Amino acid sequence: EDPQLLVRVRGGQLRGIRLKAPGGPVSAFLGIPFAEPPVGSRRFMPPEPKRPWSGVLDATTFQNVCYQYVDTLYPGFEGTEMWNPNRELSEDCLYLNVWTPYPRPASPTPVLIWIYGGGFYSGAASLDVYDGRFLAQVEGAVLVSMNYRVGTFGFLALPGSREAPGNVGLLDQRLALQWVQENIAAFGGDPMSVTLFGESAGAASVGMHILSLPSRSLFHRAVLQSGTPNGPWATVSAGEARRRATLLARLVGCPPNDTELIACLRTRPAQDLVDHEWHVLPQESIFRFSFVPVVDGDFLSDTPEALINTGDFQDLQVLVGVVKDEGSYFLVYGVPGFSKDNESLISRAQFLAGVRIGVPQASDLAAEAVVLHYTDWLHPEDPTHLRDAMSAVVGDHNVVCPVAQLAGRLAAQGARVYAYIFEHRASTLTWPLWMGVPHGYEIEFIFGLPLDPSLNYTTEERIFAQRLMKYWTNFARTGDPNDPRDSKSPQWPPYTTAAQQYVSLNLKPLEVRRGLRAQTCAFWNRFLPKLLSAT
Amino acid sequence: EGREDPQLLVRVRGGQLRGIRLKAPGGPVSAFLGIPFAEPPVGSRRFMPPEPKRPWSGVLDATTFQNVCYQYVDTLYPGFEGTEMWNPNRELSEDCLYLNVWTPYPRPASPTPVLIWIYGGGFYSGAASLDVYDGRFLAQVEGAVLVSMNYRVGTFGFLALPGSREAPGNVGLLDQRLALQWVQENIAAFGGDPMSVTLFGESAGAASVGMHILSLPSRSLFHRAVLQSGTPNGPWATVSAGEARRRATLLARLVGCPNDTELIACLRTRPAQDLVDHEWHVLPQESIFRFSFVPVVDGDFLSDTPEALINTGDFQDLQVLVGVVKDEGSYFLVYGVPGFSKDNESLISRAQFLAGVRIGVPQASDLAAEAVVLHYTDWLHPEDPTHLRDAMSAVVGDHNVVCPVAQLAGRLAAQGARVYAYIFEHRASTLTWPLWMGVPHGYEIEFIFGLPLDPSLNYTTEERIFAQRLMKYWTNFARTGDPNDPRDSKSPQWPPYTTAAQQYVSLNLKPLEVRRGLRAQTCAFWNRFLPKLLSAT
């Protein structure tokens, strides 16, 4: 019995497992329950803290993945499968994982808490790209990740009802944050230094913890990779959430009154709800998700935009960034003329039709404004430009410009902000070249996977992964991603509204740039809302 | 006769003329100045279409410039060369329908391609007798026959009560047409080729040229056309019948008048200077680059809006040279946009930029005005006074000239015409406006006419050589419909503008350089998006 592998937390005793990372062992505690299984009558309800257990609970394997839609676009293709559940699905899924150096840290160690993405309808903390061993073994970090309910089980909401108040998936994350405060110090973690980080919907989640007071006493710094609480997809209004839930109920026979309706839904097998999750969207679209956080006036006292516009963020530090090609991944999911298999060279008509699917809320005049802005009028009909502009419309509307707005409002209201753009395309990537650096393919580098020799990355990429892990961990330690040992003269400067400085992350050394899509995001952030408004 | 110069006596349809032998730097040229081509449009003829001049008896002396058409005189900067050079340099009078002819001396042997100049001045000012429209350099150095005509401006030229008989509108354009007919019948008596007539003009003169392209009766009077910094399409060159009737009725009221007949009859009793003194009071909004009395869309001269005509016209037999100067808008800011002056750097604030945009784009709704400010803002330096100043100029210049011209080039090109486009980027070493204005509106003219060749005008040697190149381009285009020199192949070639390639050339002290895209991004905003945004808002 290994003593480094035995931990006592407030609920009982855990047994971890020793894992070999490239440079040495690490202690892993996988599958720790942090809440009562949200099953039967607990479906759609806020989580409850886990009850104590007897004996030694075995924490040496990943637990189940929260029940969720499983993608089928390209069956068997690594590029999509790598995001699919790699364990059994189950509503009984509220578990978390802790990686730690081996032996356990001698000093209290800053903690990183990963919140996975997946559009609030999918995702799991057990995916290979979220493997926490490299960060713990190389940087000596204590790394935590939790499962949280997705889709109908995490965010179906009859606002104001007692039986489905919405946002329970975010309340799952919050309970895991509360768990870290109460237990992490038993693993050697420092609960007074907790950094959240996440990507896509995980990044947005991080942002809502920034914007929700009860969460603010549970972390000290945040990282939002390719996602924001503001923007067009991360939240919905009480009304639109009430609409979609009532429609999903109709589609499954409920009701044959809020309590009446939610009771019948708790009767249905999980897959019956998943079967119809995608049929409640008001328009044909990409980058829109049926069940996402709701503006309930509770977890979110107002819209994310209103909250970032007025909040005080003085004692907060944030690292925010985007990938080079945010939108490419999504075109193959609904925009006619796109495929991972051909080069997706589109006509102009295809480009206009595609803009209605990328900006599904846009009016006639507003889609025209978008088309005229992204058209290259020296080659207005070149298909290569047209496809590339299609990807930029989607990525700019859903990620880049939302990020630039958040970064600007945070910096202006006291926060200390650092911004990046990630421009390296993995040598291992299996999507076609035309997709560039797609949404989500910086993650494998920040977690250090290239340091695994069997994965067949390039020597340059291994050196690159280490640099990224230093930025992230250095940010967790200090709030500043710059190395207190490297006194070479390319320093990552803070993003400000004045200079708007950000850095390029790629194989070459840090390069400092100014203006994050400044002109084009002026269009999205400043003009387009006044347009759609006056219509 | 008997003891006068036999090379200076000519007969035209209306009688005999005596011209004058002028000195150009390279030799003598024949000038026939102040030839009347119409009955004086005075008295009961004010606002009426012109009539042919009645033949005279004896030898009409044609050695001096005749009257300038009655017009507003500029006073923003009294005695300053930048404004005085454009002011009237002969007596103001309603009796002003005269034209001028320059030819080589002795007059040419073979029939010679003809150039007709139509001055600008916003349709409220101008004269064919200004120093910068001097034909003696084109005539002497290129051997061209050059003709320029006065036309009625302001109320006398363009006040209209559309549909009435006593003020049908556009008589100023009919004045120009009557001169074009005069050239058809008489230019052979000077050695000019009536079958090779090229029009060229600038600002409102360029737009005039564009209007003759679009009016069917004019089209049988010329063969080629050059439009410098001006277009018949665009926000300022025309007004609807409704606007024109409203402005004419308002000016009448402002001068004591009072049924169209009685109302026009009253205007005809007013002193010319009373009309001029109230011209500017009829503009619907605080504006720059708007002019009270301009050509009206009458359904006669202009069968429809210029936009509709250039959109649906056959131009496969047309050859046009069109271009702009580097800083079309800067000149106009100091005539209305608070914060701007010729005597300081005009560094303005973001608030002055927003107020200035409402003035340069006087028709924009609040949303359309916001779109303009969002487009032209430098979001990395959104409060930089220098960028805001240069963006104010870009707004006015792009809205009024560069994108109207860009739209015109693309339409004519798509519909059969042969088009050549340029941007004129050289600032005269003699310019008296401040540096920040760059290359202002209308400051390529003195180079096209070849003033730099006048040794007393203190230009540089390169400026002299440059003006020769420009004269070579214009005349070659007149001779052949192609500005390129047939023999000289070493020089870089000036390609036609096309929709596929959108090629144009820069004209400056350096050799011809070819560029693609006539401010393509920004003009898509002006020409494609803004019209639909104002259609809603």
Ligand SMILES: COCCOCCOCCOCCOCCOCCOCCO
């Ligand atoms: C040049 O930067 C424009 C900055 O836009 C500010 C937002 O307002 C504009 C709103 O109008 C709609 C735009 O119409 C389409 C034509 O525009 C092309 C602009 O393409 C610039 C790309 O870099």
Ligand SMILES: *[C@@H]1O[C@H](CO)[C@@H](O)[C@H](O)[C@H]1NC(C)=O
């Ligand atoms: C790419 O493939 C898809 C499906 O195979 C097809 O629908 C699409 O039209 C193709 N792309 C082009 C540009 O033809």
Ligand SMILES: *[C@@H]1O[C@H](CO)[C@@H](O)[C@H](O)[C@H]1NC(C)=O
């Ligand atoms: C320039 O002068 C004008 C008039 O004198 C004034 O209104 C303007 O504010 C001045 N601008 C600067 C930058 O000095």
Ligand SMILES: *[C@@H]1O[C@H](CO)[C@@H](O)[C@H](O)[C@H]1NC(C)=O
């Ligand atoms: C040219 O320069 C001379 C001397 O510098 C001056 O006397 C003359 O007036 C100038 N003429 C012009 C047109 O600038």
